[model samples]
Target: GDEHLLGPAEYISSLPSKGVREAFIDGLNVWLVLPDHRVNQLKSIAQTLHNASLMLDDIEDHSPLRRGRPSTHMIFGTEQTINSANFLLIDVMEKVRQLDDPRCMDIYLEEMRNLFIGQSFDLYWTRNGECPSEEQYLDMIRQKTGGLFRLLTRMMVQIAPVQQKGLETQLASLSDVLGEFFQVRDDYKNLTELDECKFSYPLIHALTSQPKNVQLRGILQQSRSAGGLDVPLKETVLSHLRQAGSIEYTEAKMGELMEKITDSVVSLEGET
Candidate 1:
């Protein structure tokens, strides 16, 4: 009883500044494009899921900082942080029922399942000290990041009385591209001199393609063993990535996805 009753104030206080933008806002904007009347409700669901995932991700990754501040688990303790995160998910699902749409509940459950599967793959690779193929990594990104965007768009479309098949199709396509772009950009940013042992896109590319670059993989394994990359080792990894053109390749891939997203939006415009 006491465990379930812990309020979010302490949890909220432990988080980074409110000024930092929440990823859910991106989905809300997508809803706005459809002029969904339940934008507020959708926002609540998105925010709750996004924040809950962050809490668990930080704990799983053993991350020290979030949004330039100590992570929630670091301040509130892992047990409380995990319990709060689970409570948020349960609370959000209850809120979803208030919408009185069975399809909405189905979409939420499916997407949550996808999200966990994606996270599982990520944690699996990291824990095993193995590098998954580029295809496998991209699939994981789709499930984890793309799944959220898909959930937002699907819920909005189904809740609406008048559903345009063309619009729905285009929105789904657009969300996929956006999800890829989001993950690629995030991976790019996280590729600093002091790398955080996460399986980012560029790193995965280099690891898979540059078979001769045993040094790169060795450094990565060393980083994993030591918990994180030191400055010198990180620089070495960055050098290898640059030489292998992984950074450039990732950027170009992101650009292609953006162009595809633009085309999907244009198609939606004709339907609207």
Candidate 2:
């Protein structure tokens, strides 16, 4: 956790733009700027999006740590963290309005709506004990994760129009698939030996892919009745997942998804 905090802080601090990196990038970048006005507007809008995503993501994920230490909510209290997030988002809106870019405001607002709707579904699934099917998971990924990726991609493209929107589209699509792969991967790591890899995705892919059918389903039922999976039983669950080939299944699936991503990229028309 110490690493996470220091790393991001160092990165942000190292940026020459520092507090206004988002604004600088948006303002100066060709893609991020529409055929519109000055670059300063782009920077402000970009910062808004960045701040919004971080604030909401931290809350939704219930992250205990941020930048590698205690989360803002944990250290400053939930109300304060939430208030800060709201303040950041509002600042963006106010900045955008000052630029006289009504369209940009509309875009930002729509993205925010999509984010909250997606978060609602995540909360529902967590409470209902109904793990979404693969397709459902992807749908969730598209909204929950892909939305931000797509917004950023589009932001760049808008700032500087490319020959075709193909590169932006490809990048956005790849990000979505990668998000799915990484999310399942992280979940798996949480369920297994935390010591193995500083980080992993294979085990998670397995859990999502193979999952518990009937017999394995019974194991889960028993585990629950006995009061969740204890260390020994958790090991057994991991063993069952391993035996069921969930990990392997996830790996294979990731390979297939990656190939599709490559195909999409290659078919993008330009870059010959």
Candidate 3:
């Protein structure tokens, strides 16, 4: 029972400093909390690595909040936090390699590479206002966001034989498709649609899908120099998207993609 319980409770009380100590203790607790299995251990390690990357991202993106608290960059100096984040990332990667499972090491490296690529594209797209084509954007989400999901599935397959029988590939496809859906959906939430809290892919897809020569370009181009999308400009863009039936078009695309995913997943062996 104690083996299943994880770590000693008094460890947290002994931490020396507030922030670094808290981060270290949190890291230890995470490891202890993982299931006593190779796959779960690998998953926990990979996630820690991912978190480090996100912390670095927040610093790079000038994010102020994380998990309702000030971000690391906000709490610590940006330079210090960036150094810490990078150290954490490398530390986790070393632990993963020590797991000594070649399959896992391969998958983890692949995912890390994909994550960097994805984050780069995300930053570029946002700064340049260079929205990709629908398909290209979907590809970006898959590489950037869904890459981890794919790697996780493959890693699980190494530890669980049942997962190896085409399950990983199928799940990878599902993850990428879902990633695209959610990215577009979140874009909608940031702008149009009455249900502001609810995300749907139609909002972003609609805006990007507008005719190249349409007024949408002028608005986007103008918003670039203005330094931000002001309320009036946002309204105009929203109206233009609406006029282009962007919302309807996005909804239709989401439905189609969802249906295709469902059909693809349903036919998996033994799933009826």
Candidate 4:
């Protein structure tokens, strides 16, 4: 029976995204729109790492579904999936060395480091039942989600035909707020569905507001102690958040940040 098992080749071939569908290239597409010269090698680097990270994240989050199908780990087993993910990283690093730019390699390593740091914070808080302050949570999102955008932009800026003195700084600043808006909006949607039990922005705000509501606090704490909320408990928590004005507060904050990002994008129309 053991002799019939396929190696990595056959197993990977059976992956959900094989054949008919192509991997989404949103990050690569964003890079392509920039004014930089066509360094198409960058696209390969980004896609390889992005997919690799997804494989690893699915394992870490214990996610059952990815891309509307069973996750990689679910089919291939966590051990094999992890090995494949690391192999991709090694493969990408080899590709990076071909560019012969020490700076690019450095940026790659730094961003990867930052991504792990951010993921560590998220996993730690959830596992330890610890709640981070809003500022701290935002910072974590910046490092986790925003670092990839900064990596691509900064790499492009460094290699662009004409480099602006403060372009990197400006892009980095934009990435920060964009990351916050993206994460906040995602959190808001999940809360609206009453499907999220993590210490999201709205829950954090409600828990730490000036006049703390004991009922909401108790419900959240109990949910954490129980590992997660059932459907009914999730609905009750949602009710408390709405009554505490947490939902409204989160919406207003997201609107303000979005306006800032929109203004920045408008200013950069022809400049970039």
Predicted structure 1, TM vs. truth:
0.88
- Overall local distance difference test of candidate 4: 0.70
RMSD to native, candidate 2 = 7.3
- Cα deviation in Å at residue 161, candidate 3? 4.1
Give the count of colliding residue pairs in each prediction. 0, 19, 1, 0
Using Cα atoms with residue i matched to residue i, what is each candidate's TM-score against the true structure?
Answer: 0.88, 0.65, 0.72, 0.81
Candidate 4 positional error at 197, Å? 5.3
| Top candidate when judged by lDDT against the true structure | 1
Q: Candidate 3's residue-wise lDDT over 1-272, tens digit each? A: 43211111112112232242224223323322323466456645655555666666666656666556566655456666656666666667677776657877778788878978987876777776665666666677778767766665555556553323555566667667766666666665555541111112444565555546457666666656654566777787677767767777766766777886777556653541
Q: Tell me the spans in candidate 3 whose CA falls farther than 4 Å from its real position.
A: 1-36, 66-68, 161-164, 193-215, 269-272
Off by over 4 Å in 1: 1-10, 13-37, 163-166, 192-196
Tell how far residue 256 is off in model 1, in angstroms: 0.4
Candidate 1 lDDT by residue in tens digits, 1-272: 55433544246545554522244445435534444446667777776777787778888878878777778777678888888987888888888988779888998899889988998898888788778888898899888888888888888777665644446666767777788788887788777422446777887778778678879878877887788877787778888888878988887887888888788767665655
In candidate 4, how many clashes are counted? 0
After the best TM-score superposition of candidate 1, give how far the Cα of residue 11 lies from its true spot, in angstroms: 3.2
Weakest lDDT window of 10 consecutive positions for candidate 1: 19-28
Order of models, best TM-score first: 1, 4, 3, 2
TM-score attained by model 3 = 0.72
Which 10 residues in a row give candidate 3 its minimum summed lDDT? Answer: 4-13
Sorting all predicted structures by lDDT, with the top scorer first, yields 1, 4, 3, 2
